[PDB]
């Protein structure tokens with residue numbers, strides 16, 4: 001805790017920008033953009049990239065493999081890794097929960113079963129009893145830890161990182177047609193009392209002053225098997241942890257008398273929010289590197305008008321370390337990560353130009369996922385900041401939610417470190 | 420020098436030979452779930468603080484509202500201010516986000532689906548076929564290791580396996596008709612028989628919930644609550660650690676059922692439904708039954724929630740454990756003396772139920788659970804005083820004498836600070852989290 005104190009910077013977003021920067025349309029990510037969406041499977045059939053990746057998972061199971069060229073102990077072990085991966089995603093919609101105000105990501109609590117059951121108490125209808133940002137910051141961070149965050153930070157909302165247009169589906173489209181009917185929808189800020197969705201726009205109130213960012217730690221032993229199946233499993237379980245975090249915390253904020261917008265992988269760019277909220281620093285590979293977990297940590301965030309004290313950004317030397325390290329760039333199976341210096345100009349449509357960062361080719365990264373049948377993660381696994389076969393993982397150390405008691409003390413929290 | 424705590428060594432020392440530890444006689448019958456104090460008509464209605472008779476949880480709601488308005492965190496317990504009182508109830512209410520009508524008891528509804536076929540996750544993964552491909556592993560030894568590893572990923576702090584004893588499965592469940600939307604669920608609850616038949620998969624008809632005769636095993640999970648929050652019982656922060664753990668139970672069930680299905684087997688979730696969690700936990704070796712009626716575990720005492728999953732997956736049953744709880748409960752009686760409703764007996768165990776809420780025919784301490792429930796509207800919470808005062812809930816019970824582990828007999832002789840004090844992820848305590856580390860050796864023998 002006093003380590004993190006040592007590295008607090010003075011207030012101010014540390015992301016350097018120029019006058020070319022514009023908000024970024026979510027459809028441009030490699031996951032969704034038409035130029036990157038379709039990729040061949042191992043048979044040469046072109047399909048949506050995740051369906052070709054499915055074909056590789058099936059082929060690996062039948063051939064008793066945990067990953068590309070990686071023989072499992074037997075077919076049973078191969079099957080178990082994919083079963084664990086698939087199960088981890090149970091509380092996540094279509095890989096990331098990105099559709100705003102759909103399924104688990106509702107922008108109002110009013111229709112949720114938990115809100116209905118609690119309606120006679122009227123917590124969501126009662127004006128706030130606490131408006132002091134200091135007390136609120138302590139309450140909401142305590143709640144965040146109950147809700148499964150291993151790290152939590154607060155920043156003013158920088159609209160530069162909010163997607164200009166979200167990827168979503170029409171509100172009456174049933175789940176079974178969702179993947180075939182994704183659309184783009186603008187996210188705008190207006191003078192309205194509550195977050196609201198019209199036919200035309202997702203409307204965030206101008207009072208939405210703050211963003212709360214959570215880090216959800218992944219399991220080191222499993223991530224070290226990247227690009228094989230157990231790295232996929234710790235990824236997947238943490239997405240469901242993100243979803244529960246967003247819902248738990250939004251409900252807490254609503255029952256305190258404020259509004260709250262969940263996001264998971266939607267709404268805006270998590271790495272930028274996490275850096276501004278002080279969880280860590282941007283890195284060569286492009287992830288937020290944290291002191292506690294390096295880049296081996298997932299991110300989610302919640303937007304709110306609840307008064308809060310912003311945390312300070314931290315500087316523990318990541319930028320200078322990544323300058324000379326280049327280990328992620330040398331081991332990346334697709335050569336997606338640059339060995340060059342940071343610029344303001346993106347490599348392709350998948351990058352947001354106008355901000356100083358290491359510019360990576362994220363279509364090359366995604367191209368390796370159908371090939372390998374997984375979500376790679378080699379850059380995370382080799383990064384020195386992540387530090388301190390698959391049969392040995394299944395036979396080896398585990399604990400609740402994949403957390404490690406050898407390090408869990410480092411995320412203990414008292415009021416002194418919350419506000 | 421002090422020997423470092425070894426939770427695995429403790430469980431090995433107190434393991435007992437195979438066999439259900441629960442002593443029963445011939446008057447034992449399966450228990451209709453409607454008989455619980457939460458649901459039965461004799462106990463369901465309680466007065467609020469104005470003397471109005473209402474469903475008990477609605478009278479409890481009225482008391483929460485009154486406490487917030489009066490700046491209290493519990494009965495005659497002043498909060499630091501109204502904002503603190505409000506914060507405690509907001510945290511409690513939020514905790515329940517992934518739980519239907521206080522316990523997820525309706526089988527094969529909402530989160531508790533008996534088949535994965537309609538779930539969004541199953542649909543998304545359908546092209547891989549994991550739920551339709553026959554199992555690639557049938558060896559119960561490897562399956563036990565796989566499923567326990569998955570259980571820990573899924574949020575279990577403790578996990579154990581038992582053969583399914585049908586004595587503890589409810590004869591009839593409380594549920595709602597399949598065509599009833601959530602908004603009307605509380606007004607449309609019904610009973611439905613739980614039966615065992617020669618069918619390939621768990622199935623529900625208009626008249627019965629059908630568990631297959633092949634459903635051999637039950638997997639029991641312990642979900643640890645937070646010590647500092649539970650010690651505020653009967654006040655609001657004990658309600659909050661209870662509530663959050665119910666949503667953790669729900670996630671566990673769904674995660675684990677999907678893993679089992681994707682391994683080629685079927686899985687039935689339950690949370691507080693389907694059967695009696697304390698008996699399953701005892702038979703799976705998580706702990707022992709206690710005077711208060713809860714399962715007491717070596718790691719957490721009774722300050723741990725339970726859920727369970729039923730499956731045909733071949734597994735190795737765990738051994739029951741006997742670390743002397745019965746003998747300590749015979750002479751302790753702290754929970755009985757501190758219980759604000761006098762619900763817990765100070766007398767001997769018997770086979771005769773105290774009232775309709777107890778299942779007769781099994782040797783246990785017989786408590787009056789209508790008296791317990793009656794205190795919840797009075798206090799505006801879920802009490803928990805018995806859990807809070809139990810010496811096993813405290814985290815330093817265990818000492819090593821140079822030869823073996825033993826219980827320290829010396830143990831049996833506010834809310835602002837909680838909000839301002841120690842916390843960690845999911846409320847777990849890093850000073851004890853090493854106790855639940857797991858390697859293959861302690862997952863399967």
Ligand SMILES: Oc1ccc(I)cc1
Pocket residue numbers: 050095096235375
């Ligand atoms: O972050 C992500 C998103 C989609 C998938 I498929 C895997 C990892």
Ligand SMILES: Oc1ccc(I)cc1
Pocket residue numbers: 048179180
């Ligand atoms: O053209 C296509 C085909 C499948 C999908 I899913 C989306 C677009």
Ligand SMILES: Oc1ccc(I)cc1
Pocket residue numbers: 027032034167182183184
């Ligand atoms: O061509 C396309 C496909 C998906 C989306 I969202 C937008 C345009």
Ligand SMILES: Oc1ccc(I)cc1
Pocket residue numbers: 476521522661801
């Ligand atoms: O265990 C339980 C069940 C219902 C309620 I309301 C509180 C605690």
Ligand SMILES: Oc1ccc(I)cc1
Pocket residue numbers: 179542543544545546
């Ligand atoms: O066209 C398809 C088929 C399967 C899935 I999963 C999504 C889109």
Ligand SMILES: Oc1ccc(I)cc1
Pocket residue numbers: 120474605606
């Ligand atoms: O609001 C209400 C009223 C009766 C019942 I039964 C449940 C909820």
Ligand SMILES: Oc1ccc(I)cc1
Pocket residue numbers: 453458460593594608609610
């Ligand atoms: O009369 C009753 C009472 C409880 C239930 I569940 C159904 C019918």
Ligand code: SF4
Pocket residue numbers: 283284285286321322323325326327328329379382383384385
């Ligand atoms: S591997 Fe090295 S260069 Fe890449 S993100 Fe990690 S520290 Fe930076």
Ligand code: SF4
Pocket residue numbers: 331332333334335336337364365366368375376377378379380
């Ligand atoms: S996930 Fe793999 S392919 Fe993608 S950038 Fe990292 S190392 Fe390269």
Ligand code: SF4
Pocket residue numbers: 709710711712747748749751752753754755805808809810811
């Ligand atoms: S308080 Fe004492 S008698 Fe009651 S359950 Fe705990 S050990 Fe047993």
Ligand code: SF4
Pocket residue numbers: 754757758759760761762763790791792794801802803804805806
């Ligand atoms: S929860 Fe409270 S009222 Fe109920 S048995 Fe325990 S101490 Fe008594």
